[PDB]
Design a binder for this molecule. Sequence first.
Ligand SMILES: c1ccc2c(-c3cnn4cc(-c5ccc(N6CCNCC6)cc5)cnc34)ccnc2c1
Ligand SMILES: c1ccc2c(-c3cnn4cc(-c5ccc(N6CCNCC6)cc5)cnc34)ccnc2c1
Lengths: 298, 300
Amino acid sequence: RTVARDITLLECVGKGRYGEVWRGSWQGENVAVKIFSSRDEKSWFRETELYNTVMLRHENILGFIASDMTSRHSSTQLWLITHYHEMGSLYDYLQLTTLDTVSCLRIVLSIASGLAHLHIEIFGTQGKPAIAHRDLKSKNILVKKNGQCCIADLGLAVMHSQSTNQLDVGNNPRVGTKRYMAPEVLDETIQVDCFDSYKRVDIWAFGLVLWEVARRMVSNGIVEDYKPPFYDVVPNDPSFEDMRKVVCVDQQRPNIPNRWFSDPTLTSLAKLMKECWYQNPSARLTALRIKKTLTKID
Amino acid sequence: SMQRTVARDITLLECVGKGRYGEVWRGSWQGENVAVKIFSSRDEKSWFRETELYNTVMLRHENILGFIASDMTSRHSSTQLWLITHYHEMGSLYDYLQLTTLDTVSCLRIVLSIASGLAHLHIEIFGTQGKPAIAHRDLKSKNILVKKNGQCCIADLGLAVMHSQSTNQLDVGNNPRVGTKRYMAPEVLDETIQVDCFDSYKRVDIWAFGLVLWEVARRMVSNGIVEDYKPPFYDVVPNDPSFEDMRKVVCVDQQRPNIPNRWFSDPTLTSLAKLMKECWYQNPSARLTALRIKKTLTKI
Ligand SMILES: c1ccc2c(-c3cnn4cc(-c5ccc(N6CCNCC6)cc5)cnc34)ccnc2c1
Ligand SMILES: c1ccc2c(-c3cnn4cc(-c5ccc(N6CCNCC6)cc5)cnc34)ccnc2c1
């Protein structure tokens, strides 16, 4: 029996504009400590609430352990303590690793299973509201030693319940990662009062991640280098406007390499991406349909 | 004496109060008294709301309870949440008025200090070093502390809402709670309140303030005459009145707190009576603002 604040921070393993993640030691075991900037305090709270009230728990959702906050003198320390994944993010994993058909499908099915689990309302004692993520990307997915993935970073999440028909968007000024923003977010037509709109934004982002992964699967003895979505048409840290011109005005999407089309698996994955990338959000596949499709190609 | 792992440097000494969130304790921290407000896990939204208001608005004022710290720790099926503030040994206005009568100077000092706290919450300050308007939403004599200098400060921002013009997303939070029934304005009771107008919430605070002003005025001695402490509407609702009990008296019956005709033979009580009256208009838009009350009281 010990307290969360007594976790020993050992090394910083990730660092962005909104926070840091550290490998920490708690009673001799590795944990991950995400430390939020005070500026992203509403994300820390949303995640904490989700994990500690909805009790979100699933093989493909990052395992919560604890949350801790202390504030004084305008200094606020915001910690979310989770299961530690030493292989790091999917983004990290894809840089050099190449995949065979089995490992590629294991990765994308586990992500689909995580997302389907989030999107669906479950009834009964072990139930949950429907949840949309709103910042899905390869840096927000962890790779486990067993080859499965799990989805992290629920701080922008929005929720919906069938019995009340109530949408819970919380209040957070943080917006999703610009590279992964759906057309409707970029041209500001997204119907913000509709829960389904948020699920559809997640589906868009999932198709981009699918593309990042599929590039690294070997066929005919070759792969493509890791690249981020839209690598050839926008800069690093692209602006809202850079993305809008590419995605909305030019109607661009990632290109599919020729070699994919002689591989049955990559051909099926290209079709799935297309079904995630429709300009019309209501035309996109659901997470459930994506999971069903992937279950059938392995 | 007890410590909790949610803040190991604070020693809890005694429970001094209970509220809609739980207990408040006198505690000791680095040799000084502090007040520790302990939330149940049920109310982590109010805990966060109050913390954010103190921590990001950097809300500070002589007549707003002073924030010291906030802590929370959470695991599966165990969550502790604390707000630590300055401790006022004279206790709440509600308790003080049970035991204490007021002279004219003390009465004015109390009601002016409440008005000044409330105007500081309510006032939106525009520009780069501004401040959102804040509405309290549970103003009552139990949520005001008496300080040793004879001024008061307003406490409990767990239900408070804020609005800055610059940001376009009006949000009454998502915590399932409204005000103390006894202090609820008529428009809350008959559901006519204009929920999309941030100022509606300010006007609801002004109605509550007039009730507190009545509670206080009752205990000012005038020509050797004073009334016992009573809560607002004590003579027409029971203890712990329901939303419905209140709806009947304030809306259907149109009841207001009685203003003894005798008050009008005293200049201070006369001014206060006029102020209460102008906090109690059925029409929320006709009510005085916190700032105007403050100026009127500063003139006395
Ligand atoms: C978003 C993403 C993650 C989290 C996490 C999180 C949980 N586990 N974990 C592990 C790493 C990590 C480990 C090892 C490496 N490397 C080893 C390979 N070579 C160099 C890089 C890199 C990264 C990062 N973050 C996390 C916890 C809480 N919120 C999050 C929100
Ligand atoms: C609402 C009200 C208060 C707070 C407080 C808070 C700060 N100071 N303080 C002091 C008391 C208190 C001291 C002495 C007495 N008595 C001794 C004299 N005889 C009558 C009983 C009674 C009460 C209670 N709460 C507080 C902190 C945080 N949120 C709040 C929200």
